Amino acid sequence: VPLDGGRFATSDLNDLYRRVINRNNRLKRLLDLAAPDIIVRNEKRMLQEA
RNA sequence: AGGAGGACACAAACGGCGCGCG
Numbered sequence: 783v784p785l786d787g788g789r790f791a792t793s794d795l796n797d798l799y800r801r802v803i804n805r806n807n808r809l810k811r812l813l814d815l816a817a818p819d820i821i822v823r824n825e826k827r828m829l830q831e832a
Numbered sequence: 833a834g835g836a837g838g839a840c841a842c843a844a845a846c847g848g849c850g851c852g853c854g
Contacts, residue, residue, distance in 0.1 A: 783845065791846070 798832075805829045 783791045809825045817825075 785845090794847090 802829070802832045805832045 785791045805825070805828055809822070809829055812822055812825055
């Protein structure tokens with residue numbers, strides 16, 4: 783929902799979904815580009831925690 | 833002369849902090 787002026791009120795679930803989507807897209811991008819095992823492990827841990 | 837031809841619809845939100853009252 784917007785608030786007074788050209789701004790939208792912060793939504794809790796939206797930000798969590800945004801974090802999850804960004805992390806998962808980064809993981810997909812790396813897995814396409816064959817990142818090293820250490821990097822993909824760290825990305826997978828970050829995705830799980832997100 | 834005769835004769836012939838010729839736009840309908842549509843009324844303000846969500847979480848903290850503080851205070852106060854029952």
